[PDB]
Structure 1
Amino acid sequence: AKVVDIRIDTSAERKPISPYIYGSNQELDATVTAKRFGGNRTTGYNWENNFSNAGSDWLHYSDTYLLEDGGVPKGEWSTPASVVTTFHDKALSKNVPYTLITLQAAGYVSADGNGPVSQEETAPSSRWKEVKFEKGAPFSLTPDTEDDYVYMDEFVNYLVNKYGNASTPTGIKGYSIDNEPALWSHTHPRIHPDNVTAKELIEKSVALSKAVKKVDPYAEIFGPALYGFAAYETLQSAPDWGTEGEGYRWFIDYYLDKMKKASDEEGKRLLDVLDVHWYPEARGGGERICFGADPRNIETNKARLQAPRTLWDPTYIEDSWIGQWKKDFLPILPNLLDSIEKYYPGTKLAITEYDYGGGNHITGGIAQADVLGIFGKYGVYLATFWGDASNNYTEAGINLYTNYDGKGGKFGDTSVKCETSDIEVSSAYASIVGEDDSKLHIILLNKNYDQPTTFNFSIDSSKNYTIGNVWAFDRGSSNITQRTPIVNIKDNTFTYTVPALTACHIVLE
C-alpha cells in the first residue's frame, strides 16, 4: 500500500496565480484564459491584405492560409487585419481576458497570395513588402497596399482604434516581437536568409517596442519567443555571440540586460514579458515524450509523468541532452526567474508554446495538470499550449483548472502552501479565492501507474472544513466527472485513496 502525506497551510506562502497561465494557441475543446496568435505563419503575415507565408513548413507558399484556418468570413478577406480581428473577436466571445498578437520583425511580409516564393525571390523582391516599425507619417485605417512598406505601429493603431487600448476591457493586451528569431534563417529563409545576430535582435526589439508603446502605452511587449534551450543559451550560435555574449552566462541574461539598458535610456519599460517556448526534450522508452511519441510505450508515458519536474525540481535530472549537459541551467523556471531578478527585475515570464505530448492519453492529461500547477505556483504570467483539439486529455488537464464542473467552476487564484511527502508518485497544488480561505481548492495528481495511492491530508486553516466535493478524470474518460464527496474530516484531516493515474480537483468548504 502506497501512503503519501499532504500538508497544506492556507495562511502560508500566499501568492497570486496569474489568470493567464491557462491559455492556448489553437482552438481547443477547453475553457482557456489567454489566446496567442503566433507561430511560424505569423512571421510573414501582412496585416494590410492578410496574406502570409508558410516558410519551410510548406514550400515557402504565400497564400490565404491564415484566413482559411482562422475561419475568417470570405467577405472580410480583403479587410485589413481581418485575420487578427476575427481571432480577437472569437477570444472576446469566449470570455477570454488576454489576447496576445504577434507583430512582424523578421523584416518582410507577404505581398501576395500567389503560391511558392522561389529562392530567387528571396526578400527584397516583388513577392514581399518591407516591414517598418514606425510610419513617421499620419496613420490610416485604410493602409496603402500599393506601396513597398507595411508599418507595425499603423497595424497597432488599427487595432487600438477598433478595440480600445490595452487598459480597456476589450483591448488587445499584449504583442509579441515576432516568433522564434533564432530559427528565422531555418523556417523563413526567403524572408531572412542570414542567421539572426544578437545585436540585430536587440535593435529590432527595442525599435518595435518603442513604436508599439507610442500608440498603446498600456500594451505589454513579449520577447524574444525563443524556440528552445539552444536559443536560450546562445541564440542558436548567433554569429556575434562570441563578442556580444562576453561576460554573460547565457543569451537570456544578455537579452534582459540589454532590454533593461534600452528601457533605462528611453525612460520607460520596453520589455514586459520574457517569452520562451518549451517543448520538453525528456525521453523515455527510447523516444522524446512529445512529437511522434507512441502512447503504447509505457516507459515513455512514465517519463512524461516525471518530465514536469525539470521545470522546478533541483533533484530531478531527465534523460535528454539538456539534463545531461546543461545541469547548470536546471531546474528551468527558477533559472529563468533568477535571471530576471538579476538583470531586469519586474519582468514577467511567459511560456508561449509548450506540449508535453501524450495529448490523447491519460499521462498527457496528468502532465498537463502538473505543468499548470507548477506555472501557477512558481509565478509564470502567461502560458499557451501549442496543439489541436484532438488532445482530449490535455484539454481535460486545462479544464480541471478552468471549468471543472462544466459551469465555470475554477481553481482558486491565490496559491497557498501545499507539500507532498512523495513528489515522484504525486503532485498537489492548493489555492483559495482572493484572500478568503472559506473554500480551499486542491489539485491532486496520482502518478502511480498501476496502483492506487492513499493520501493522508493535514490542513492548517482558519476555517474548519466539513465537506470536500470532487471532480476527476482518469483512463476511463477524459470527461471530468463529479465523484463521491469527502465527508469525514476530523479537525481538518482526512484520508483519501485515489486510483492509479487519476487527476482530481477537490473543493473543501
Structure 2
Amino acid sequence: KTITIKVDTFKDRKPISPYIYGTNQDLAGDENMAARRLGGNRMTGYNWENNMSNAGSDWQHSSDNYLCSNGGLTQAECEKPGAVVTSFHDQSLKLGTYSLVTLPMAGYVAADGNGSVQESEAAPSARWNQVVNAKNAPFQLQPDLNDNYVYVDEFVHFLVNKYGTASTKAGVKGYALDNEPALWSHTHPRIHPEKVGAKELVDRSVSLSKAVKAIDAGAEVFGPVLYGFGAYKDLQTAPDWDSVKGNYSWFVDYYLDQMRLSSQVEGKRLLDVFDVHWYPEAMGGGIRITNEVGNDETKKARMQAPRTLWDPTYKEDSWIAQWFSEFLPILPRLKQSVDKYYPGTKLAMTSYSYGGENDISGGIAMTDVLGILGKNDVYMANYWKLKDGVNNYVSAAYKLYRNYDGKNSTFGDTSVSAQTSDIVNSSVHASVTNASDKELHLVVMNKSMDSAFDAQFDLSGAKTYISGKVWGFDKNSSQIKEAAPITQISGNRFTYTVPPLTAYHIVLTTG
C-alpha cells in the first residue's frame, strides 16, 4: 500500500498556539507542556482561605483537604491561605507554563474538612461559606477565617500582590468561571440543588467577571466551561431555555451574545475565551471510547474519533452524530458561533480525553488531536486523566510533539499545509518555525491495525531538504525512540514506511 502526502511550507501558514499543549493533572513531567489548568469538579467549592474543597457526587459530597494532597502540600502548608493555588502557580512559573485558575460561582465554598455533607446539610449551613464577588472593604492578605464569607476579588488581589498582574511575566494569566454549571445540580447538589438557569448563568458570570477585571483588567476570563454537547445545546434543558432561546440555534449563541451585550453595558470585555469540555461519545464495538480501552472496534473508533473535530465527511457512532449532526464537525461549528456572536473571543477545550490511556490507540488518537487543535484556531486545550496512575500513551503523544529527543525539542510554531491521499488510515501534520526554510517538522501516523503503508512525501519549500531524522512510538514501546534516518532525499521527495499503529516525528533539514 502506498499513500501520497503533499507538504507545502508556503501554503496555509498559521500560528499554532502553544497552549494547545496543555493539561489538567500533571503527567510524567517530561512532556514540556505550555499550559496548566487548576479546574474540574473540586474547584467549584474550593475555599482559598483554608484550602478546603468538596468532592460532590464524585466522593460522598465530602469536604476535605484533597486539593492540598493532590498538590503535594504538607499539613502545615495546607493551613496557609491560597496555598493550593500558589503552589500550583509556583510550579507553572518553574515550568514556564500559562496558569488557568478556576474561581467559584455556584455560590458557596467548603467551610471545613469534616467529610460528607448530607442532603439536609446543603448550603446554606454550617458546612458552607458564602461566596461574595466584590468585598467592598479593605483587602486582607490574611483573610478573615472566622466569618461566613469568602471574597473572590480579595483572592485575586492576593495573587496579584504576590505575582503581579497577568500582563507581567509572573502573573496568573487566566481565570475560569467555575466548572460545568449545567452539572452543578448533579455534581454539586449540596451547593446548588436546582438546575442552573440560562439567565442565571449569565448574571452570575457578569458579576464575577466584573469583580475580577476590577482587580486585573489584563487577566483572561474563560467561560462557561460547559461539560459537553447537552450543555452546548440548551444548558442541559435549563428551566428558562424556552423563554430565552428566541432565534438562537443553541445555548452557545445565547451565552456569546449575552456576554457581548453585558460587556457593552459595562464598557469592558467580560469574556475572553469560550471554554468547553469534550469527552467523545464516539462508540466502537459496543463501547464508548472514553470508558475503557475496549476491543478492536473500540480501538479503531478511538483513532477515527478525532475526525469529529474537523472533518465534514465523518459521522461517528454517537447520539450526537445521530440526532445533532448539523453541529458537527465541532470545532468549525464552535468557531462559526464565536466569530458571529462575540467576535474576537478565543476558543479553549479545557478538559478532554480520547481514552485508551495505556494503549497505542490512545497515543495515536492524541497525536492526531494535537495536530488538529493546533491548526484549527484553538487557543488552549487541557487533557484530563480519566484513568489514574500512568497514562503512558497520552504522555507519548505529547512528548512526540514537545520533547521528541529528550532535550525538549518541539514541533514548529507555524502550521503549514499537509494533505494525505488516505484520511482513514493516515493522518499527518506539518510545521515550521519563524517561516524556516532550514528545518521542517512532520508528524505522521498509521491508524491501520493490520497494514503498513509506504508514505511518499512530496515537499514544497524555498530550499532543498537533503536529510531527515525520525523519532517515533508504536505498540511495542511508548517511549519515544530514534528511528532509521532519511539519509538521501532527491528533488524534495522521499518515501518512508509507516508500520501499523505507529506515529513518527520526522525532522527534515536543508543543511
> TM-score, normalization: structure 1?
0.98
Structure 2 residue 24 is matched with structure 1 residue 16: no
Q: What is the aligned counterpart of 1:301 among 299, 302, 306?
A: 299
Corresponding residue of 1:310:
308
What CA deviation, in whole Å up to 9, does each residue of 1:384-409 have, x standing for no partner? 00014521001100111111111010
Taking the aligned partners of 1:262 and 1:268, their CA distance within structure 2 comes to 9
Bigger mean CA deviation after superposition, 305-314 or 442-451 = 442-451
- Secondary structure at 2:280's aligned position in 1? coil
Aligned-residue offset at 1:479: 0.1
Looking at structure 1, the residues matched to 428 and 471 of structure 2 have their Cα atoms a distance apart, in angstroms, of: 15
Within 1, Cα distance between the matches of 2:489 and 2:343? 43
The runs of 5 or more residues in structure 2 that have no matched partner are none
Q: After the TM superposition, which residues 416-435 of structure 1 pair with which residues of structure 2 at under 5 Å, given as runs?
A: 416-435=416-435
Can you list the C-alpha shifts for 1:291-311, whole angstroms capped at 9, x where unaligned? 2343xx101000101000000
2:20 is paired with a residue whose SS is strand
Counterpart in the other structure of 2:475? 475
Deviation at 1:487, TM superposition (A): 2.0
CA deviations on 1:54-74 (whole Å, 9 max, x unpaired) are 111111111111111111122
In structure 2, distance between residues paired with 1:458 and 1:474: 24
1:389-428 matches, cutoff 5 A: 389-428=389-428
CA deviation string 1:417-449 (max 9, x = no partner): 111111001011000102223211111011121
Secondary structure of 1:45's aligned partner: coil
1:125 aligns with 125
Compute the displacement of 1:121 (Å): 1.3
Distance 1:78 1:185 in 2: 30
Aligned partner of 1:113 in structure 2 is 113
Residue 91 of structure 1: CA displacement?
2.1
- Structure 1 residue 325, shift from structure 2 partner: 0.7
Structure 1 unaligned regions, length at least 5:
none
Structure-2 residue corresponding to 1:330 = 328
Which residue identity lines up with residue 309 of structure 2 in the other structure? L
CA contact (8 A) 1:27 1:389 kept: no
Looking at structure 1, the residues matched to 495 and 458 of structure 2 have their Cα atoms a distance apart, in angstroms, of 9
Number of the residue aligned with 1:214: 214
Q: What SS does the aligned partner of 2:438 have? A: strand
SS in 1 for 2:480: strand
Report deviation, 1:227. Answer: 0.4
Q: Distance in 1 between matches of 2:319 and 2:10?
A: 40
Query: Counterpart of 1:162 in structure 2: which amino acid?
Result: K
Match of 1:487 in 2: 487
Which structure 2 residues correspond to residues 96-495 of structure 1 after superposition, within 5 A? 96=97, 98-294=98-294, 297-387=295-385, 388-495=388-495
State the distance in 2 between where 1:154 and 1:437 align: 50
Corresponding position of 1:93 = 94
Do the aligned partners of 1:40 and 1:187 also contact (CA within 8 Å) in 2?
yes
Q: Which amino acid aligns with 1:360?
A: N
1:491 Cα deviation (Å)? Answer: 1.3
| Contact residue 245 and residue 251 of structure 2 kept, 8 A | yes
Once the two structures are overlaid, the 10-residue window that deviates more, 143-152 or 303-312, is: 143-152
Is 2:108–2:131's contact at 8 Å kept on the other side of the alignment?
Answer: yes
CA distance in 1: counterparts of 2:317 and 2:61, whole angstroms: 35
Matched to 1:482, the amino acid is E
Q: Structure 1 residue 95: deviation in Å?
A: 2.7
- Preserved CA contact (<8 Å) 2:293 2:359: no
For 2:466 and 2:169, how far apart are their aligned partners in 1?
Answer: 38
| SS of corresponding position for 2:171 | coil
Alignment of 1:82 with 2:93, yes or no, is: no
Is the deviation greater in 490-499 or in 228-237?
490-499
Distance 1:211 1:437, change over 3 A: farther
The letter of the residue matching 2:152 is: M
Alignment check: 8 A CA contact 2:350 2:381 kept: yes
Residues 261-301 of structure 1, C-alpha deviations (whole Å, 9 max, x = no match): 1112222211110000000000000100112343xx10100
**Per-residue CA distance 1:129-179 (angstroms, 9 max, x = gap):** 110111111211011011111111111111111111111111111000000
Q: Distance in 2 between matches of 1:373 and 1:187?
A: 33
SS at match of 1:436: coil
| TM value normalised by structure 2 | 0.98
Match of 2:371, SS state, is: helix
Displacement after TM superposition at 1:223 (Å) = 0.5
What do the CA deviations read for 1:194-217 (whole angstroms, capped 9, x no partner)? 000001110111111111111111
Q: Determine if contact 1:131/1:150 at 8 Å carries over to the other structure.
A: yes
Local SS of the residue matching 1:27:
coil
Offset at 1:11? 0.9
**Count of aligned positions:** 505
State the match for 2:508 in structure 1. 508
Deviation at 1:77, TM superposition (A): 1.3
Residue 27 of structure 2: aligned partner: 28
Contact kept in structure 1, 2:68 and 2:84, CA below 8 Å: yes
- Of residues 236-245 and 72-81 in structure 1, the stretch that sits farther from structure 2 once superposed is 72-81
Give the Cα separation in 1 of the matches to 2:120 and 2:210: 34
Specify the SS of the correspondent of 1:484: strand
2:21 match: secondary structure: strand
User: C-alpha offsets along residues 84-124 of structure 1, whole Å, 9 cap, x if unaligned?
Assistant: 1111112222232x110000000000011111112111111
2:6 aligned partner: 7
CA distance in 1, matches of 2:278, 2:286: 20
Cα offsets for 1:14-52 (capped at 9, x unmatched) = 110000001111120132111110111110000011000
Which is further off, 50-59 or 73-82? 73-82
> Could you tell me how far apart the structure 2 residues matched to 1:230 and 1:282 are?
15
1:386 and 1:400 map into 2 onto residues whose CA distance is 18
- 1:373 is paired with a residue whose SS is helix
Conservation of the 8 A alpha-carbon contact between 2:453 and 2:498? yes
Deviations 1:465-504 (CA, angstroms, capped at 9, x unpaired): 0111111000110000111111221111111111111101
Paired residue secondary structure (1:479): coil
Q: Find the aligned partners of 1:425 and 1:131 in 2 and give their Cα distance.
A: 51
1:83, 1:179 → 2: CA distance?
17
